Amino acid sequence: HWGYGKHNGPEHWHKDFPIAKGERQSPVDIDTHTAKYDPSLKPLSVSYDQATSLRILNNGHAFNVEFDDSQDKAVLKGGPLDGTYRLIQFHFHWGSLDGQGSEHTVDKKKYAAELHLVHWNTKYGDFGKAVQQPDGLAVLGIFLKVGSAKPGLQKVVDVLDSIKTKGKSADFTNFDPRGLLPESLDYWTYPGSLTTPPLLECVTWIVLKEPISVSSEQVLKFRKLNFNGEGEPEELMVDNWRPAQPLKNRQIKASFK
Ligand SMILES: O=C(O)Cc1cccc([N+](=O)[O-])c1
Ligand code: NI
Ligand code: NI
Secondary structure, eight states: OOOSSTTTSGGGGGGTOGGGGSSSOSOOEEOTTTSEEOTTOOOEEEEOTTOOEEEEEEOSSSEEEEEOOSSSSSEEEETTOSSOEEEEEEEEEEOSSTTOOOSSEETTBOOSEEEEEEEEEGGGSSHHHHTTSTTSEEEEEEEEEESSOOGGGHHHHHHGGGGOSTTOEEEOOSOOGGGGOOSOOOEEEEEEOOSSTTOOSOEEEEEESSOEEEOHHHHHHHTTOBSSOTTSOOOBOOOOOOOOOOOOSOOOEESOO
16 A cells, blocks of 8 residues: 555555566656667657547546557557557656656756656557566656646646546546647657556656646646545645656667757
8 A cells, every 4th residue: 555655655665566676667867968869769650640538537646548549549659669559548747846746857857747648569469468568568758847838738637626536537538638749759768667566667768858838727736636535534646756766777868969
Protein backbone atom coordinates (compact mmCIF):
# COMPACT_ATOMS: atom_id res chain seq x y z
CA HIS A 1 0.00 0.00 0.00
CA TRP A 2 2.31 2.29 -1.70
CA GLY A 3 2.13 5.91 -2.48
CA TYR A 4 4.09 9.17 -2.43
CA GLY A 5 4.42 9.87 1.37
CA LYS A 6 7.03 9.66 3.94
CA HIS A 7 5.93 6.36 4.92
CA ASN A 8 5.05 4.66 1.66
CA GLY A 9 6.81 6.73 -1.04
CA PRO A 10 9.55 6.04 -3.58
CA GLU A 11 12.20 5.48 -1.20
CA HIS A 12 10.18 2.36 0.22
CA TRP A 13 9.17 0.75 -3.03
CA HIS A 14 12.23 -1.44 -3.33
CA LYS A 15 11.00 -3.61 -0.40
CA ASP A 16 8.05 -4.84 -2.48
CA PHE A 17 9.66 -4.42 -5.92
CA PRO A 18 13.41 -5.06 -5.89
CA ILE A 19 13.50 -3.96 -9.51
CA ALA A 20 13.35 -0.40 -8.01
CA LYS A 21 17.14 -0.67 -7.69
CA GLY A 22 17.60 -2.08 -11.20
CA GLU A 23 19.68 -1.22 -14.16
CA ARG A 24 17.14 0.70 -16.24
CA GLN A 25 14.88 2.60 -13.86
CA SER A 26 13.06 5.83 -14.67
CA PRO A 27 12.87 8.76 -14.55
CA VAL A 28 16.38 10.18 -14.99
CA ASP A 29 18.01 13.54 -15.21
CA ILE A 30 18.67 14.48 -18.85
CA ASP A 31 22.15 16.02 -19.02
CA THR A 32 21.77 17.96 -22.23
CA HIS A 33 25.45 18.44 -22.75
CA THR A 34 26.21 14.79 -22.53
CA ALA A 35 23.22 13.42 -24.60
CA LYS A 36 24.63 12.52 -28.00
CA TYR A 37 23.05 13.43 -31.23
CA ASP A 38 22.22 10.22 -33.04
CA PRO A 39 21.90 10.38 -36.84
CA SER A 40 20.66 6.62 -36.93
CA LEU A 41 17.39 7.89 -35.38
CA LYS A 42 14.51 7.44 -38.07
CA PRO A 43 12.13 10.43 -37.97
CA LEU A 44 9.06 10.27 -35.09
CA SER A 45 5.66 9.64 -36.48
CA VAL A 46 2.68 10.48 -34.34
CA SER A 47 -0.61 9.37 -36.03
CA TYR A 48 -3.47 10.43 -33.83
CA ASP A 49 -6.13 11.37 -36.41
CA GLN A 50 -8.31 8.34 -35.67
CA ALA A 51 -7.94 8.34 -31.92
CA THR A 52 -10.91 7.29 -29.91
CA SER A 53 -10.88 8.49 -26.30
CA LEU A 54 -13.32 6.64 -24.05
CA ARG A 55 -13.08 7.44 -20.36
CA ILE A 56 -11.18 9.31 -17.67
CA LEU A 57 -10.37 7.47 -14.42
CA ASN A 58 -8.92 8.57 -11.06
CA ASN A 59 -6.82 5.49 -10.26
CA GLY A 60 -5.73 6.71 -6.85
CA HIS A 61 -2.33 7.94 -7.95
CA ALA A 62 -3.15 10.00 -11.14
CA PHE A 63 -5.93 10.26 -13.65
CA ASN A 64 -5.83 8.31 -16.88
CA VAL A 65 -7.49 9.34 -20.17
CA GLU A 66 -8.13 5.98 -21.80
CA PHE A 67 -8.35 5.14 -25.50
CA ASP A 68 -9.75 2.34 -27.63
CA ASP A 69 -6.58 0.31 -28.29
CA SER A 70 -8.43 -2.57 -30.04
CA GLN A 71 -7.26 -1.26 -33.49
CA ASP A 72 -4.41 0.90 -34.89
CA LYS A 73 -6.25 4.10 -34.41
CA ALA A 74 -3.63 6.24 -32.60
CA VAL A 75 -0.10 5.06 -33.17
CA LEU A 76 3.50 6.02 -32.58
CA LYS A 77 6.22 4.85 -34.90
CA GLY A 78 9.66 5.90 -36.02
CA GLY A 79 12.23 7.53 -33.86
CA PRO A 80 14.05 4.96 -31.98
CA LEU A 81 11.20 2.48 -32.38
CA ASP A 82 11.02 -0.68 -34.42
CA GLY A 83 7.48 -1.45 -35.32
CA THR A 84 4.06 0.12 -34.30
CA TYR A 85 3.02 1.26 -30.86
CA ARG A 86 -0.67 1.83 -30.03
CA LEU A 87 -1.92 4.54 -27.68
CA ILE A 88 -3.68 3.11 -24.60
CA GLN A 89 -3.80 6.08 -22.22
CA PHE A 90 -2.28 9.32 -21.15
CA HIS A 91 -1.71 10.70 -17.66
CA PHE A 92 0.23 13.41 -15.88
CA HIS A 93 2.56 13.76 -12.94
CA TRP A 94 2.55 17.07 -11.10
CA GLY A 95 3.63 18.96 -8.03
CA SER A 96 2.23 20.73 -5.01
CA LEU A 97 3.98 23.88 -6.29
CA ASP A 98 4.89 25.15 -9.72
CA GLY A 99 8.58 24.59 -9.00
CA GLN A 100 8.35 20.78 -8.98
CA GLY A 101 6.20 18.01 -10.49
CA SER A 102 8.00 16.56 -13.47
CA GLU A 103 9.64 13.13 -13.28
CA HIS A 104 12.34 13.72 -15.83
CA THR A 105 14.57 16.72 -15.20
CA VAL A 106 16.62 18.66 -17.74
CA ASP A 107 20.02 19.71 -16.40
CA LYS A 108 18.38 19.28 -12.96
CA LYS A 109 15.49 21.61 -13.87
CA LYS A 110 12.08 20.41 -12.64
CA TYR A 111 8.99 21.39 -14.63
CA ALA A 112 5.55 21.91 -13.04
CA ALA A 113 4.18 18.70 -14.57
CA GLU A 114 4.85 16.04 -17.18
CA LEU A 115 2.42 14.42 -19.64
CA HIS A 116 2.91 10.74 -20.48
CA LEU A 117 1.28 9.28 -23.60
CA VAL A 118 1.59 5.50 -23.13
CA HIS A 119 1.78 3.17 -26.14
CA TRP A 120 2.30 -0.59 -26.41
CA ASN A 121 4.09 -2.59 -29.10
CA THR A 122 1.56 -4.31 -31.29
CA LYS A 123 3.79 -7.30 -31.78
CA TYR A 124 2.84 -8.37 -28.28
CA GLY A 125 -0.89 -8.35 -28.81
CA ASP A 126 -2.03 -6.48 -25.72
CA PHE A 127 -0.75 -4.19 -22.99
CA GLY A 128 -0.44 -6.90 -20.39
CA LYS A 129 1.88 -8.95 -22.44
CA ALA A 130 3.81 -5.91 -23.71
CA VAL A 131 4.78 -4.80 -20.20
CA GLN A 132 6.65 -8.14 -19.84
CA GLN A 133 8.99 -7.26 -22.63
CA PRO A 134 12.04 -4.96 -22.74
CA ASP A 135 10.66 -3.17 -25.81
CA GLY A 136 7.01 -3.43 -24.83
CA LEU A 137 6.08 0.19 -24.25
CA ALA A 138 6.88 3.58 -25.74
CA VAL A 139 6.09 6.57 -23.57
CA LEU A 140 6.05 10.01 -25.13
CA GLY A 141 6.86 12.50 -22.36
CA ILE A 142 6.03 16.21 -22.59
CA PHE A 143 6.97 18.80 -19.99
CA LEU A 144 4.50 21.37 -18.74
CA LYS A 145 5.54 24.88 -17.69
CA VAL A 146 3.22 27.43 -16.17
CA GLY A 147 2.43 30.42 -18.41
CA SER A 148 -0.25 30.77 -21.03
CA ALA A 149 -3.23 28.41 -20.96
CA LYS A 150 -3.17 25.33 -23.14
CA PRO A 151 -6.54 25.42 -24.91
CA GLY A 152 -6.52 21.74 -25.75
CA LEU A 153 -6.13 20.83 -22.09
CA GLN A 154 -9.24 22.62 -20.86
CA LYS A 155 -11.60 19.78 -21.64
CA VAL A 156 -9.54 17.54 -19.32
CA VAL A 157 -9.36 20.15 -16.57
CA ASP A 158 -13.07 20.79 -16.54
CA VAL A 159 -14.11 17.15 -16.00
CA LEU A 160 -11.76 16.66 -13.01
CA ASP A 161 -14.41 17.66 -10.45
CA SER A 162 -16.38 14.60 -11.56
CA ILE A 163 -13.54 12.23 -10.75
CA LYS A 164 -12.30 13.81 -7.59
CA THR A 165 -11.67 10.61 -5.64
CA LYS A 166 -10.03 7.29 -6.18
CA GLY A 167 -12.03 4.90 -8.33
CA LYS A 168 -14.29 7.45 -9.97
CA SER A 169 -14.56 7.51 -13.74
CA ALA A 170 -16.44 9.54 -16.31
CA ASP A 171 -17.18 9.23 -19.99
CA PHE A 172 -14.56 11.13 -22.00
CA THR A 173 -15.25 10.75 -25.67
CA ASN A 174 -14.10 12.78 -28.61
CA PHE A 175 -10.93 14.16 -26.98
CA ASP A 176 -8.11 14.96 -29.44
CA PRO A 177 -4.67 14.40 -27.86
CA ARG A 178 -3.05 16.36 -30.72
CA GLY A 179 -4.03 19.46 -28.84
CA LEU A 180 -1.52 18.56 -26.07
CA LEU A 181 1.62 18.42 -28.30
CA PRO A 182 4.22 21.19 -28.69
CA GLU A 183 5.27 22.51 -32.06
CA SER A 184 8.53 20.53 -32.31
CA LEU A 185 9.00 16.75 -32.07
CA ASP A 186 12.71 17.02 -31.22
CA TYR A 187 13.41 14.50 -28.48
CA TRP A 188 15.71 12.64 -26.20
CA THR A 189 15.43 8.84 -25.81
CA TYR A 190 16.69 6.16 -23.52
CA PRO A 191 15.64 2.69 -22.19
CA GLY A 192 13.84 2.78 -18.87
CA SER A 193 10.90 1.69 -16.76
CA LEU A 194 7.46 2.45 -15.44
CA THR A 195 7.70 4.92 -12.59
CA THR A 196 5.20 3.37 -10.20
CA PRO A 197 5.03 -0.15 -8.85
CA PRO A 198 5.57 -2.66 -10.39
CA LEU A 199 8.43 -0.58 -11.91
CA LEU A 200 8.75 -2.89 -14.94
CA GLU A 201 11.74 -2.28 -17.22
CA CYS A 202 9.68 -2.27 -20.41
CA VAL A 203 9.75 1.35 -21.65
CA THR A 204 11.44 3.13 -24.49
CA TRP A 205 11.21 6.75 -23.28
CA ILE A 206 10.85 9.54 -25.83
CA VAL A 207 11.00 12.91 -24.02
CA LEU A 208 10.26 15.99 -26.06
CA LYS A 209 12.60 18.93 -25.72
CA GLU A 210 9.93 21.63 -26.13
CA PRO A 211 7.58 22.02 -23.18
CA ILE A 212 3.93 23.02 -23.49
CA SER A 213 2.63 25.98 -21.57
CA VAL A 214 -0.43 25.58 -19.24
CA SER A 215 -1.96 28.23 -17.02
CA SER A 216 -1.66 28.46 -13.29
CA GLU A 217 -5.40 27.87 -13.11
CA GLN A 218 -5.18 24.67 -15.16
CA VAL A 219 -2.50 23.11 -12.91
CA LEU A 220 -4.38 24.25 -9.81
CA LYS A 221 -7.22 22.06 -10.89
CA PHE A 222 -4.98 19.01 -11.03
CA ARG A 223 -4.09 19.72 -7.39
CA LYS A 224 -7.76 19.55 -6.30
CA LEU A 225 -7.90 15.88 -7.08
CA ASN A 226 -7.70 13.39 -4.20
CA PHE A 227 -5.60 10.27 -3.65
CA ASN A 228 -8.27 8.96 -1.27
CA GLY A 229 -11.61 7.35 -1.96
CA GLU A 230 -14.89 9.11 -1.28
CA GLY A 231 -15.76 9.03 2.42
CA GLU A 232 -12.11 8.84 3.48
CA PRO A 233 -10.03 11.70 4.81
CA GLU A 234 -8.93 14.08 2.09
CA GLU A 235 -5.43 13.86 0.80
CA LEU A 236 -4.72 16.08 -2.13
CA MET A 237 -3.29 14.38 -5.20
CA VAL A 238 -0.02 16.28 -5.51
CA ASP A 239 3.62 15.33 -5.86
CA ASN A 240 2.86 12.06 -7.68
CA TRP A 241 6.30 12.03 -9.31
CA ARG A 242 9.12 9.62 -8.71
CA PRO A 243 12.47 11.46 -8.40
CA ALA A 244 15.32 10.90 -10.84
CA GLN A 245 17.07 7.55 -10.61
CA PRO A 246 20.65 6.58 -11.39
CA LEU A 247 21.48 6.45 -15.06
CA LYS A 248 23.81 3.42 -14.62
CA ASN A 249 25.03 2.02 -17.85
CA ARG A 250 22.74 4.03 -20.20
CA GLN A 251 23.22 6.60 -22.82
CA ILE A 252 20.62 9.25 -23.60
CA LYS A 253 20.37 9.96 -27.33
CA ALA A 254 19.20 13.23 -28.96
CA SER A 255 17.30 13.41 -32.16
CA PHE A 256 18.60 16.99 -32.82
CA LYS A 257 21.87 18.92 -32.66
O1 LIG B 1 5.00 5.07 -15.31
C1 LIG B 1 3.95 5.57 -14.76
O2 LIG B 1 3.45 6.73 -14.83
C2 LIG B 1 3.22 4.59 -13.90
C3 LIG B 1 2.37 3.64 -14.69
C4 LIG B 1 1.73 2.69 -13.98
C5 LIG B 1 0.92 1.76 -14.56
C6 LIG B 1 0.70 1.82 -15.89
C7 LIG B 1 1.28 2.84 -16.54
N1 LIG B 1 1.14 2.85 -17.82
O3 LIG B 1 2.23 3.31 -18.27
O4 LIG B 1 -0.10 2.34 -18.37
C8 LIG B 1 2.11 3.76 -16.03
NI1 NI C 1 -0.32 -1.66 -1.69
NI1 NI D 1 3.96 8.32 -16.04
